[PDB]
Coordinates of N, CA and C and ligand atoms in Angstrom, one line a residue:
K1 N 113.3 105.6 87.7 CA 113.5 105.2 89.5 C 112.9 106.2 90.0
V2 N 112.0 105.5 90.7 CA 111.1 106.3 92.0 C 112.1 106.3 93.1
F3 N 112.2 107.9 93.5 CA 113.2 108.1 94.9 C 112.3 107.9 95.8
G4 N 113.1 107.6 96.8 CA 112.6 107.8 98.2 C 112.7 109.4 98.8
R5 N 112.1 109.8 99.6 CA 112.0 111.5 100.0 C 113.6 111.6 100.3
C6 N 113.9 110.8 101.5 CA 115.1 111.3 101.8 C 116.4 110.9 101.0
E7 N 116.1 109.6 100.3 CA 117.4 109.5 99.1 C 117.2 110.9 98.1
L8 N 116.2 111.0 97.6 CA 116.4 111.9 96.8 C 117.0 113.7 97.4
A9 N 116.6 114.0 98.7 CA 116.9 115.1 99.5 C 118.5 115.0 99.4
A10 N 119.0 113.8 99.8 CA 120.6 113.4 99.7 C 121.1 113.3 98.5
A11 N 120.6 112.9 97.6 CA 120.9 113.2 96.1 C 121.1 114.8 95.8
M12 N 120.0 115.6 96.3 CA 119.9 116.8 95.7 C 120.9 117.8 96.5
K13 N 121.3 117.2 97.8 CA 122.0 118.0 98.6 C 123.5 118.0 97.8
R14 N 123.8 116.5 97.6 CA 125.0 116.4 97.1 C 125.3 117.0 95.9
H15 N 124.3 117.4 94.6 CA 124.5 117.8 93.6 C 124.5 119.5 93.8
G16 N 124.4 119.8 94.8 CA 124.2 121.5 94.9 C 123.3 122.2 95.0
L17 N 122.0 121.3 95.3 CA 121.0 122.3 95.7 C 120.7 122.8 96.8
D18 N 120.8 122.5 97.7 CA 120.5 123.1 99.2 C 121.0 124.4 99.1
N19 N 120.1 125.4 99.2 CA 120.3 127.0 99.1 C 121.1 127.4 98.2
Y20 N 120.6 126.6 97.0 CA 120.8 127.0 95.7 C 119.9 128.5 95.3
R21 N 120.9 129.4 95.3 CA 120.0 130.7 94.7 C 119.0 130.9 95.7
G22 N 119.3 130.6 97.0 CA 118.4 130.8 98.3 C 117.8 130.0 98.4
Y23 N 117.4 128.8 97.7 CA 116.1 127.9 98.0 C 116.7 126.8 98.8
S24 N 116.3 126.7 99.9 CA 116.7 125.4 100.6 C 116.1 124.3 100.4
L25 N 116.9 123.1 100.8 CA 116.7 121.8 100.0 C 115.3 121.4 100.2
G26 N 114.3 121.5 101.1 CA 112.8 121.1 101.3 C 112.3 121.9 99.9
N27 N 112.4 122.8 99.6 CA 111.7 123.4 98.4 C 111.9 122.5 97.2
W28 N 113.2 122.1 97.2 CA 113.5 121.4 95.5 C 112.7 119.7 95.9
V29 N 112.8 119.1 97.0 CA 112.1 118.1 97.3 C 110.7 118.1 97.3
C30 N 110.1 119.4 97.9 CA 108.8 119.5 97.7 C 108.3 119.5 96.4
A31 N 109.4 120.5 95.3 CA 108.9 120.6 94.2 C 108.9 118.9 93.5
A32 N 109.8 118.2 93.5 CA 109.8 117.2 92.8 C 108.8 116.2 93.4
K33 N 108.3 116.3 94.6 CA 106.7 115.5 94.7 C 105.9 115.9 94.1
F34 N 105.4 117.1 94.0 CA 104.5 117.4 93.3 C 104.7 117.6 91.9
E35 N 105.6 117.7 91.3 CA 106.1 117.5 89.9 C 105.9 116.2 89.3
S36 N 106.4 115.2 90.1 CA 106.7 114.0 89.6 C 106.4 112.7 90.2
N37 N 106.2 113.2 91.3 CA 105.8 111.8 92.8 C 107.2 111.2 92.6
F38 N 108.1 112.1 92.8 CA 109.6 111.5 92.9 C 110.2 110.5 91.9
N39 N 109.3 110.6 90.6 CA 109.4 109.4 89.7 C 110.5 110.2 88.6
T40 N 111.7 109.4 88.1 CA 112.6 110.3 87.0 C 111.9 109.9 86.0
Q41 N 110.8 109.1 85.9 CA 110.5 108.6 84.4 C 109.2 109.4 83.8
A42 N 108.7 110.4 84.8 CA 107.6 111.2 84.6 C 107.6 111.8 83.3
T43 N 106.7 111.9 82.6 CA 106.5 112.9 81.2 C 104.9 113.5 81.5
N44 N 104.6 114.5 80.7 CA 103.5 115.0 80.7 C 103.3 116.0 79.7
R45 N 102.6 115.8 78.9 CA 102.1 116.8 77.7 C 101.6 118.3 77.8
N46 N 102.2 119.2 77.2 CA 101.4 120.2 77.4 C 100.4 120.7 76.3
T47 N 99.7 121.9 76.7 CA 98.8 122.0 75.9 C 99.1 122.2 74.5
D48 N 100.4 123.2 74.5 CA 101.3 123.9 73.2 C 101.8 122.5 72.7
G49 N 101.7 121.4 73.1 CA 102.5 120.3 72.5 C 103.8 120.2 72.9
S50 N 104.2 120.8 73.9 CA 105.7 120.5 74.7 C 105.5 119.8 75.7
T51 N 106.5 118.8 76.3 CA 106.5 118.0 77.1 C 107.2 118.4 78.4
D52 N 106.8 118.1 79.3 CA 107.5 118.3 80.8 C 108.2 116.8 81.0
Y53 N 109.6 116.9 81.5 CA 110.3 115.7 81.7 C 111.1 115.5 83.2
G54 N 110.8 114.4 83.4 CA 111.7 114.1 84.7 C 111.3 114.5 85.9
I55 N 112.1 114.0 87.1 CA 111.8 114.2 88.6 C 111.5 115.9 88.9
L56 N 111.7 117.1 87.8 CA 111.5 118.4 88.1 C 110.4 118.8 86.6
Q57 N 110.3 117.9 85.9 CA 109.1 118.2 84.9 C 109.5 119.4 84.0
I58 N 110.7 119.3 83.3 CA 111.4 120.3 82.7 C 111.0 120.4 81.4
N59 N 110.5 121.5 80.8 CA 109.8 121.9 79.7 C 110.6 121.7 78.4
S60 N 110.4 121.0 77.3 CA 111.0 120.9 76.2 C 110.6 122.5 75.4
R61 N 109.8 123.3 75.8 CA 109.4 124.3 75.2 C 110.7 125.0 75.3
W62 N 111.4 125.1 76.1 CA 112.7 125.9 76.4 C 114.0 125.4 76.7
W63 N 113.9 124.1 77.2 CA 115.0 123.4 78.0 C 115.9 122.5 77.8
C64 N 115.2 121.6 76.8 CA 115.7 120.8 76.5 C 115.2 119.9 75.0
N65 N 115.9 119.2 74.3 CA 115.3 118.9 72.9 C 114.7 117.6 72.8
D66 N 113.3 117.5 72.6 CA 113.1 116.2 72.2 C 112.6 115.7 70.7
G67 N 112.8 116.7 70.0 CA 112.7 116.7 68.4 C 111.2 116.7 68.0
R68 N 110.1 117.1 68.7 CA 108.9 117.3 68.4 C 108.4 118.7 69.0
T69 N 108.8 119.5 69.2 CA 108.6 120.9 70.0 C 109.0 121.8 69.1
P70 N 108.6 122.1 67.7 CA 109.1 122.6 66.7 C 109.1 124.5 67.0
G71 N 109.8 125.1 67.0 CA 110.2 126.4 67.3 C 110.6 126.4 68.9
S72 N 111.0 125.2 69.6 CA 111.4 125.4 70.8 C 112.9 125.8 71.3
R73 N 113.1 126.0 72.3 CA 114.6 126.0 72.6 C 115.3 125.0 73.3
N74 N 116.3 124.9 73.2 CA 117.1 123.5 74.4 C 118.2 124.4 75.0
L75 N 117.9 125.2 76.1 CA 118.9 126.1 76.8 C 119.6 125.2 77.7
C76 N 119.4 124.4 78.0 CA 120.1 123.2 79.1 C 121.0 122.1 78.0
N77 N 120.9 122.6 76.5 CA 121.6 121.7 75.7 C 121.5 120.2 75.9
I78 N 120.5 119.7 76.1 CA 120.2 118.1 76.7 C 119.2 117.5 75.5
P79 N 119.3 116.3 75.4 CA 118.0 115.6 74.9 C 117.0 115.4 76.1
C80 N 115.7 115.4 75.9 CA 115.0 115.5 77.1 C 114.9 114.2 77.7
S81 N 115.3 113.3 76.8 CA 115.3 112.2 77.3 C 116.5 111.8 78.3
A82 N 117.4 112.5 78.4 CA 118.5 112.4 79.4 C 118.0 112.9 81.1
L83 N 117.0 113.8 80.9 CA 116.1 114.1 82.1 C 115.6 112.9 82.8
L84 N 115.1 111.8 82.1 CA 114.4 110.7 82.5 C 115.6 109.5 83.3
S85 N 116.5 109.7 83.5 CA 117.8 108.8 83.8 C 117.2 109.0 85.4
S86 N 117.8 107.4 85.9 CA 118.1 107.2 87.3 C 119.3 108.3 88.1
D87 N 119.9 108.7 87.2 CA 120.8 109.8 87.7 C 120.4 111.2 87.6
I88 N 120.1 111.9 88.6 CA 119.9 113.0 88.4 C 120.5 114.5 88.1
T89 N 121.6 114.1 87.8 CA 122.6 114.8 87.5 C 122.0 115.9 86.4
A90 N 121.7 115.5 85.2 CA 121.2 116.3 83.9 C 120.1 117.0 84.5
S91 N 119.2 116.6 85.2 CA 117.8 117.5 85.7 C 118.4 118.5 86.9
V92 N 119.3 118.1 87.6 CA 119.9 119.0 88.8 C 120.5 120.3 87.7
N93 N 121.5 120.0 86.8 CA 122.2 120.7 86.3 C 121.2 121.8 85.6
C94 N 120.2 121.3 84.9 CA 119.4 122.2 83.9 C 118.5 122.9 85.1
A95 N 117.9 122.1 86.2 CA 117.4 123.0 87.0 C 118.0 124.2 87.6
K96 N 119.4 124.2 88.0 CA 120.3 125.1 88.3 C 120.3 126.4 87.0
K97 N 120.0 126.1 85.9 CA 120.0 127.2 85.0 C 118.5 127.9 85.1
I98 N 117.3 127.0 85.2 CA 116.0 127.6 85.3 C 115.8 128.4 86.3
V99 N 116.3 128.0 87.8 CA 116.0 128.8 89.0 C 116.8 130.2 88.8
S100 N 118.0 130.2 88.1 CA 119.0 131.1 87.8 C 118.4 132.3 86.8
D101 N 117.2 131.9 86.2 CA 116.9 132.6 84.9 C 116.1 133.9 85.4
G102 N 115.8 134.4 86.5 CA 115.3 135.5 87.0 C 113.7 135.3 87.7
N103 N 113.5 134.1 87.8 CA 112.0 133.7 88.3 C 111.7 132.7 89.2
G104 N 113.2 132.4 89.6 CA 113.2 131.6 90.8 C 112.5 130.4 90.3
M105 N 112.1 129.8 91.7 CA 111.3 128.6 91.3 C 109.8 128.6 91.2
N106 N 109.3 129.6 90.8 CA 108.1 130.1 90.4 C 108.0 129.4 89.1
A107 N 109.1 129.3 88.6 CA 109.2 128.3 87.0 C 108.1 127.0 87.4
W108 N 108.0 126.6 88.4 CA 107.8 125.2 88.6 C 106.3 125.5 89.3
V109 N 105.1 125.2 88.4 CA 103.7 125.7 88.8 C 103.5 125.1 90.4
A110 N 104.0 123.7 90.2 CA 103.6 122.8 91.4 C 104.2 123.3 92.5
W111 N 105.5 123.9 92.5 CA 106.4 124.6 93.7 C 105.3 125.6 94.1
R112 N 105.0 126.7 93.0 CA 104.7 127.9 93.4 C 103.1 127.7 94.1
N113 N 102.4 126.5 93.7 CA 101.2 126.2 94.2 C 100.7 125.6 95.4
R114 N 102.1 124.8 96.0 CA 101.6 123.6 96.7 C 103.1 123.8 97.6
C115 N 103.8 124.2 97.4 CA 105.3 124.6 98.3 C 105.8 125.8 98.7
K116 N 105.6 126.9 98.0 CA 105.8 128.4 98.4 C 105.1 128.7 99.6
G117 N 105.8 129.5 100.5 CA 104.6 129.6 101.6 C 104.5 128.7 102.4
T118 N 104.9 127.2 102.2 CA 104.7 126.2 103.2 C 105.9 125.9 104.0
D119 N 105.7 125.1 105.3 CA 107.1 124.6 105.7 C 107.7 123.6 105.1
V120 N 108.2 123.9 104.4 CA 109.3 123.0 103.1 C 110.1 122.2 103.7
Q121 N 110.7 122.8 105.3 CA 111.7 121.9 106.0 C 111.2 120.6 106.2
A122 N 109.9 120.5 106.4 CA 109.3 119.3 106.4 C 109.4 118.0 105.4
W123 N 109.5 118.5 104.7 CA 110.0 117.5 103.3 C 111.4 116.7 103.8
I124 N 112.4 117.3 104.5 CA 113.8 116.8 104.8 C 113.7 116.3 106.0
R125 N 112.6 116.4 106.9 CA 112.5 116.3 108.3 C 112.9 114.6 108.5
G126 N 113.6 114.2 109.4 CA 114.2 112.7 109.7 C 115.1 112.4 108.8
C127 N 115.8 113.1 107.7 CA 116.5 112.6 106.8 C 117.8 112.8 107.2
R128 N 118.7 111.8 107.2 CA 120.2 111.6 107.4 C 120.9 112.5 106.2
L129 N 121.2 113.8 106.7 CA 121.9 114.3 105.6 C 123.1 115.0 106.4
Ligands
CL201 CL1 114.2 123.2 103.8
CL202 CL1 114.2 134.0 94.0
NA203 NA1 112.7 122.3 73.0

């Protein structure tokens, strides 16, 4: 599923991301735009052979099991494929664990490089929430 910007913002708000660990909703929408272009089916292989999955490009080296990242963790205890669903619940719940682990949204390289320090409220502007 490719989300619309406001559609995704509303879905993330309903799932409790707005101000989650102090990150306003715009941050999460901005991160999803640059991680996946709002596409729940996005995958990308990393150098170390791990793969990033889903709208927030959650990495199999730590967070989900894809059966092909030897010696990896599955800290969200989910198959990585669950992160590609039209229903973003699994991605959101896993993202909540990642953002809580001490490094905040810096876990998302695209957020660090393209959202952090910008006017992230712009990403939810005009949305009916
Ligand atoms: Cl915001
Ligand atoms: Cl933080
Ligand atoms: Na894994």
